[PDB]
């Protein structure tokens, strides 16, 4: 082998192989010929110096120009490319698979990396597959996530983690399930709130709620459809509220695999819940299965008061209306029940800040 403009005998690996014309050129003549064309000729003069051989050429030539030229010479190449050819900055793409950067000025939505020779969508940067043809990137991204075996193996744990906990004070989002503990502590803002209804957990004598009888205790106030109360329901009764409104729920899966955060010396460690997964609980523990049912209940704005008996309606009346109810003359228990239910649903809405 030898350089095609000066004849210098040199091995193939020690010269620059022009990807277009395949002329072998020494580093010195390559570097000298292309910098003089930038500083004294025009952009069209940057053909090979040996053979005299538009946008794909510059896209490939930019690679070899970057390694051989000087920084100020490489900048003049982008300047003349912008001011003489493109009227704008060149579209520079970064390969997500091999971290190589390259100019891509073609019409196709699939770019082939000049380094790792792998093809990717120029807008979502994921590796190109035939399923992406004629499909939005979100449809394609959803197709891969819903065909990833290890994502499906997680089961409903992903649904509980996707529905995250947003701090009502500092809006910091946590991609965590609630579990059985409702008293949440935000590390960023120190605000204490209920993860089910986002109401404040008040310190001693901080609660402003009227007729509160636990003012001197750490506590919060919850709407009747908050997980704080609905966690005490049986899974059967929670499913009954769902069935009465034609809301489907899983009982079979599609140690509990729900990810929790254990505080360790090195910060926070992702630990699995690992509690018992009873039959009919979709592979989750008891607390996370009830959390899954209550999330479906909350998402559809189902009212648990529709299943209240008389004693439950009296408790709700004293709790949310601050009045001990009294049966009226001529009322039977059904009429007493309907009156209490009507007044409760009219005056006391469901959780106004519950994530639905």
């Amino acid at each position, epitope marked *: 082998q030898e350089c095609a403009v000066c004849g210098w005998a040199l091995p193939h690996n020690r010269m620059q192989a022009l990807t277009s014309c395949e002329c072998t050129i020494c580093p010195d003549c390559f570097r000298q010929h292309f910098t003089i064309a930038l500083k004294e000729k025009h952009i069209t003069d940057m053909v090979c110096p040996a053979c005299g051989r538009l946008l794909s050429y510059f896209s490939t030539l930019d690679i070899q120009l970057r390694e051989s030229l000087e*920084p*100020d010479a490489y900048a003049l190449f982008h300047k003349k490319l912008t001011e003489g050819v493109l009227m704008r900055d060149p579209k520079f793409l970064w390969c997500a698979q091999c971290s190589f950067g390259f100019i891509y000025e073609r019409e196709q939505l699939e770019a082939t990396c000049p380094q790792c020779h792998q093809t990717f969508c120029v807008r979502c940067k994921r590796q190109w597959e035939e399923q992406h043809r004629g499909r939005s990137c979100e449809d394609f991204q959803n197709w891969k996530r819903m065909n990833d075996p290890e994502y499906q193996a997680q089961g409903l744990a992903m649904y509980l983690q996707e529905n995250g906990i947003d701090c009502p004070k500092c809006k910091f989002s946590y991609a965590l399930a609630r579990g059985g503990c409702m008293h949440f502590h935000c590390t*960023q803002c120190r605000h204490q709130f209920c993860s089910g209804c986002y109401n404040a957990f008040y310190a001693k004598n901080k609660c402003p709620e009227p007729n509160c009888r636990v003012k001197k205790s750490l506590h919060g106030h919850h709407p009747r459809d908050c997980l704080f109360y609905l966690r005490d329901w049986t899974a059967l009764r929670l499913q009954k509220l769902l069935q009465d409104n034609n809301v489907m729920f899983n009982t079979e899966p599609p140690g509990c695999r729900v990810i929790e955060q254990k505080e360790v010396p090195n910060g926070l460690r992702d630990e699995a819940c690992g509690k018992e997964t009873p039959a009919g609980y979709a592979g989750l523990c008891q607390a996370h299965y009830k959390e899954y049912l209550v999330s479906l209940i909350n998402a559809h704005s189902l009212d648990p008061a529709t299943l209240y008996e008389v004693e439950e309606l009296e408790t709700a009346t004293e709790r949310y209306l601050h009045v001990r109810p009294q049966p009226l003359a001529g009322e039977d228990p059904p009429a007493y029940q309907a009156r209490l239910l009507q007044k409760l649903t009219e005056e006391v809405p469901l959780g106004q800040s519950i994530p639905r």
Partner: nanobody
Amino acid sequence: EVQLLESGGGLVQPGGSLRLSCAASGFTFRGYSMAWVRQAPGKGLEWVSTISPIGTYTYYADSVKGRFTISRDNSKNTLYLQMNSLRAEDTAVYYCAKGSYSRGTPFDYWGQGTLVTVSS
């Protein structure tokens, strides 16, 4: 030699606005992309935004899209970051960074950094 100096950081109330600046020197400003990266408490670096040599293309991390605006004044060799609707999670040291075209290095130098904190 490359020198980058950020300014404009400070204490911001939630939902407030703030404009960062970055005076650059020691290289051809127009010849390179410029980027902003940030160090959240207990973290390393998170890419925020990148602007092309003459501002043709502006890229943003998902968490700042629609709230942040990157810009540059090539006549002054200054990079700008307009930050709107700031949240507590935006609290970080914000670094100015000189872009690069080499493999695996979207930027090769980043400055001293200006601290932005968002109260709660």
